[PDB]
Design a protein around this ligand. Structure first.
Ligand SMILES: [Zn+2]
Ligand SMILES: [Zn+2]
Ligand SMILES: [Zn+2]
Ligand SMILES: [Zn+2]
Ligand SMILES: [Zn+2]
Ligand SMILES: [Zn+2]
Length: 147
């Protein structure tokens, strides 16, 4: 790849999001990547799917990602993959802040201070791990060293 050639994908077509949401909703999915057709589908919990997705494609240009719960950890993986748009059903404040810093196009249904643990009474151990870390690449590296 030429370091002189940069793709700019900054908007998503509103009817593809519409279509992907219909699929996400109809299949109780937890993660979806969509290009006009469905290219990755998962319903597991936590980061396992985002990592599965990361391991599967170098990038997601021309595609959109839908995710149930987007924390800083998932934001980092997704940012590196360069999807056209990420739609988060719930996004945490750290994730939102990060995606703005990176000019990634994204939308959300609910915003929350931070992703929560199994209980719903405290912070997800992965979110706490990466909470005071700045760099998405450093974050991806540390998360992978748990899987
Ligand atoms: Zn280079
Ligand atoms: Zn570039
Ligand atoms: Zn491209
Ligand atoms: Zn939604
Ligand atoms: Zn930063
Ligand atoms: Zn970096």
């Amino acid at each position: 790849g030429s370091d002189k050639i940069h793709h700019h994908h900054h908007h998503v077509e509103k009817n593809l999001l519409r279509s992907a949401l219909k699929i996400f909703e109809k299949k109780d999915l937890s993660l979806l990547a969509y290009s006009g057709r469905s290219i990755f589908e998962s319903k597991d919990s936590g980061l396992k799917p985002v990592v599965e997705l990361f391991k599967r494609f170098d990038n997601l240009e021309g595609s959109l990602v839908i995710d149930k719960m987007v924390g800083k950890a998932a934001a980092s993986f997704l940012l590196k993959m360069k999807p056209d748009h990420i739609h988060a059903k719930v996004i945490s404040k750290p994730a939102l802040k990060l995606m703005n810093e990176y000019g990634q196009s994204f939308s959300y249904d609910e915003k929350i201070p931070f992703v929560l643990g199994k209980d719903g009474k405290s912070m997800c151990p992965f979110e706490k791990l990466v909470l005071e870390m700045d760099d998405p690449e450093e974050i991806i590296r540390i998360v992978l060293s748990k899987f």
